[PDB]
Design a protein around this nucleic acid. Structure first.
Lengths: 100, 48, 61, 72
RNA sequence: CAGUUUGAUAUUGGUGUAUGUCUAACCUGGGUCCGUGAUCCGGAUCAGGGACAGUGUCUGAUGGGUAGUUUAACUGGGGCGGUUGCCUCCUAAAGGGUAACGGAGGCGCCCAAAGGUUCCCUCAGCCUGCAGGUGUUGAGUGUAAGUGCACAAGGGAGCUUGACUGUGAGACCGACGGGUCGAGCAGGGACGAAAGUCGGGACUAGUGAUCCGGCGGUGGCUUGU
RNA sequence: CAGCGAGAAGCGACUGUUUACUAAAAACACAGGUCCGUGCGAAGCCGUAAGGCGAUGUAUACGGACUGACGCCUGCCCGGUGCUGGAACGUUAAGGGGACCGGUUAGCUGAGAACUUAAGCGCCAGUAAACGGCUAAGGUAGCGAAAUUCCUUGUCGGGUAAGUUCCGACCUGCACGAAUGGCGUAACGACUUCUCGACUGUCUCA
RNA sequence: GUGCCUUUUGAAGAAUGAGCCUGCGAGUUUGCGGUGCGUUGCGAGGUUAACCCGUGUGGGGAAGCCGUAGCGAAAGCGAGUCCGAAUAGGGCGAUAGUAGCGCGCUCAAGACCCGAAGCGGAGUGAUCUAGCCAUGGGCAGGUUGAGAGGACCGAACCCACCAGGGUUGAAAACCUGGGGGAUGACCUGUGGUUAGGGGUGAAAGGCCAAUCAAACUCCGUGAUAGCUGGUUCUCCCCGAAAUGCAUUUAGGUGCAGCGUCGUGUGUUUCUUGCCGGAGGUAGAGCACUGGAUAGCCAAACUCCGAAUGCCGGUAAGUAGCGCGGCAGUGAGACUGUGGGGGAUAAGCUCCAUGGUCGAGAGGGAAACAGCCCAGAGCAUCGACUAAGGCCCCUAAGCGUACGCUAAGUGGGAAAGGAGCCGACAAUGUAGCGGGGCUCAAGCGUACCGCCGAAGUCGUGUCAUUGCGUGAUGGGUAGGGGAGCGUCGUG
RNA sequence: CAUAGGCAGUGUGGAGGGAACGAGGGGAAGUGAAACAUCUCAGUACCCUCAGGAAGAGAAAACAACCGUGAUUCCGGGAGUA
């Protein structure tokens, strides 16, 4: 961290913009493409069961996201879901029930 | 001698532009019209 | 443990592909005579040079 | 009381004849209009000549004055 | 910083008109007596001073007496003298770049028009008696030089505020930070019938990174709500 | 065993002390002089304090500063800095005060102006044997090619056969000067300088 | 045929270090640290820390951490997201990891080893020396004459002015001969006492235990060195820099330039021909500006204006680029060419562009890093050549033929004068390397031949690399690889 | 009066030592910042009082967040994160 007296790189560029949120929570996210390979025959999809299939860390909030396509009906019981994912699940005959 | 003025119109009450203007030449509070982005119109911005 | 350079952790951010990004310098004051386009050219984040990124990557953990 | 100079500006022609360019590239950096803008060539704020359309650079004399031209 | 020093406040009370007075806190390195064989100390007791002084906390002044350190670099050794950033020219060897305490100069601004647009005009110099003939750049271009500008970028009028807001295809120059040009699009405007031009000035100097802090706006968020 | 003597100049009055181990001196000290402080739990000094020295002293005493026996003298300047005294008035900290403006849903609470006050400073006088200078005043007395004079081996006189040294004067004082004392001074000096007599292996010259 | 190391542009150097042998002496260790590579296990998962059980190296332990989705200041949205009024344009993202082990680099610790002057804390020192305090002692002898004296002469005693000696001494301050005080501010014994930013000082920064512009000892402590020195076994392949910007900066360092290794790409590199371009140098000229007696001059004059060089395209012929690990270098030297400063100087200094040295052996120039020839894998008692030479030193021509020189010119030089003169410094010929050379062994021009290196060819042999064959193997700083030896363990 | 003081009688009371560890107080500089004063070194070296076999801490005027845990101490994380 020393450029021979010249003003260091880390001391002439401005600090990064903004603050940080001490209580922001990040969800463990599951895309539909990789959620349609764990359940190739449909069925109910609980959070504690998603943990056992190695798709999300333990003890966090899940949020299904909408990348990919789903061809079978899934009854997902998660903490949140994106708009595109919710449409795709419903189109395939599934139902989305949020806890939060 | 030439100070920095801050223009403002009578509606948005948001300081949009700043400019130079010779005091002694234009002692009268300077004025012109600009594009206020809040108002989205070509209103008149009287010097503050 | 390493201690990350407290100064550099406040000035650089790492993207999802590992790129290291900075903010442009010169947009804090004396902004009167800087035309609108110059201020825009100083907005946003700019990528680092390779030699500079190497040192920051190696001084920020 | 001598010994003062202004650091170099790197003026001059940046694209020569027969050189293929993309729209907007700098062709010439100059002070004043030593070369005037021709077909498909624009003038910048500081006399810079830049191509308006992709093509090959070509110099010539249009209307009795040296110009740059872009040939699609 | 020690020291010296000012004021407030605590130790610190009564009473009268900032200033008197009283005695009881407090002070006597004043006298005498006892512990006691004792110039220390303490306790008596008379003699005074006296809510002052001394001391604690807070506070202004002074403070080489002491203490910690700074006191730039370049440089035909060092000191003295001079210079340190930006712009123009020559050295610079017909791209670009290129050094010396090499050769010449400027800048730290200015203009509410000396900006934008539409329209119109051509100068300096010379000759003749405001007028006429000649005169193509030798005048002018806010400001140094250079590259340009007579198709005017020079001169004169009308109208205006683009000396905009949201952007930046693509490129030039720098080790880097950074510096510079920029098509096209949207908003909302100026000028013009229109094509079109307008994101300050013919161009290139007229400026200063981050940290910290001030002012206006907006409403994104921080410790149970 | 057991003094060489004489004339002259410079500095210091003298006897003394000094850089143990390259400088003994013109340096320090001194007796004498002036100024400043101290009223006695003195001032000053060692110590955080007690307690001590000053002193078992008391303005003819003690401490600090400079000059340095003795003789003739010690000129002008108080504008600057410092010191002494006066503080009308201006400014000024803490403290006292709490105008008024906010947050919350009268209370609590945040920031907080006007006003009140000391020293100090600005201000007014004095002070130079105070630091200092000669417009505040522009160097008097005395001395002067000097422990000071670059030019310089100044010029003149004396001394020598020959004198960049020495002695007496001149004054063009680069850049003397009155207690960081001026000019002299009998005696003194393992001090510096010049000259003469006696004497010699210092030398001719070994 | 001019040592070794270090440091240098350059050292046998008369620059530093080493008298010699033997032994000892400098890149280490920690970490569920950071990072890259290799390898191993598992693999959308990987893996434990503390701790628990066990004789051991074994088993358990999911708290955690890394991967799994990103964008934004954040609310938030999410293969998107943020700026934005925008279904405008953009920034950032979308289209196999982890845990050990080994190695390189790195972070914090003394961190490769050695080396200050000095700073701070606590103590020890006035037996030396500087003061003061208490109590004793010493001053032969003779003079002077208010029997006084900081009086006189002079031994003891105290001191140290001069000279000589000594100077690895008899002595870390003395000896010999002179010299000063020698009744006082004197000398001295014994006992006390003042202690380090402190003492004491008739004042020299003197003295305070041979040390004083701040004593000595232990501790912080393995202080700090942008500095100096040292850093130990081998070979194979490649192989620099002394430049630009910035710098409290100039002998340091950051980034860029130049090296190496891994990985991806594959002719993209480079050379030559041709083709398309801009220019304002050399030269030249006066049309502008200036100088100036029809003729002239000019870095900052140009009516003109090459050769080269530069940018791009293309053809033929034979290294380049992206991403990462690790560097060193950033003091350059001379010589050719174009210039500036200097004086129409310098082995001068500052630039641009080549060469060599640096880091380059070998041959030549007598010796002579930078000049001419030439790039050393190793062996060779073969051959041909390069620069340079062929009378003897010394390999090869007293070469052949024509002509010139009379000065030893050759074997140093000017204006100028009629190959010559001009010509002229100091140890010893000394300005051909020496002998000698005009009966050239000198210069010129042809012809013939030969000598001459680690060059090339011939022969044998090893190694790197690409596909039996082609190329390749000097090398300092430095990068990579393969190994020798010592001790110990299974 | 009275106390101060003095006298008499007793106490397996104290005094000093000790390698490291501990609690509470006082508290440097070299060094780093490529200078230096805020800052670091570091509450380290050293010093002072008091101990015990260990010391200290320790039974909520504590956390948390509207759900809840329930004296203190120590170890690995959280994390070189806020």
């Amino acid at each position: 961290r020393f450029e021979g007296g010249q003003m260091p790189l880390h001391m002439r560029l401005p600090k990064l913009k903004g603050f940080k949120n001490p209580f922001k929570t990040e969800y463990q996210v599951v895309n539909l493409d990789k959620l349609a390979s764990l359940y190739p025959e449909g069925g109910e999809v609980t959070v504690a069961d998603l943990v056992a299939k190695g798709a999300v860390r333990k003890n966090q909030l899940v949020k299904v996201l909408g990348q990919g396509e789903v061809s079978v009906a899934l009854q997902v019981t998660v903490d949140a879901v994106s708009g595109s994912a919710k449409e795709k699940i419903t189109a395939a005959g599934g139902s989305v029930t949020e806890l939060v | 001698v030439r100070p920095k003025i801050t223009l403002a119109c009578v509606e948005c009450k948001e300081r949009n532009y700043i400019t130079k203007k010779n005091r002694r030449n234009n002692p009268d509070r300077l004025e012109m019209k600009k594009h206020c982005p809040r108002c989205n119109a070509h209103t008149a911005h009287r010097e503050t | 443990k390493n201690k990350t350079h407290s100064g550099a952790k406040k000035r650089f951010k790492i993207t999802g592909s590992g790129k290291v990004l900075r903010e442009r310098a010169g947009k804090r004051h004396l902004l009167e005579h800087k035309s609108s386009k110059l201020t825009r050219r100083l907005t946003g984040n700019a990528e680092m040079a390779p030699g500079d990124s190497a040192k920051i990557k190696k001084m920020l953990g | 009381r001598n010994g003062r100079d202004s650091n170099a500006q790197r003026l001059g022609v940046k694209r020569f004849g027969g050189q293929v360019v993309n729209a907007g590239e700098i062709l010439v950096r100059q002070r004043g209009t030593h070369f005037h803008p021709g077909a498909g060539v624009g003038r910048g704020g500081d006399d810079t000549l830049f191509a308006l359309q992709a093509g090959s650079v070509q110099f010539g004399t249009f209307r009795g004055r040296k110009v740059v031209n872009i040939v699609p």
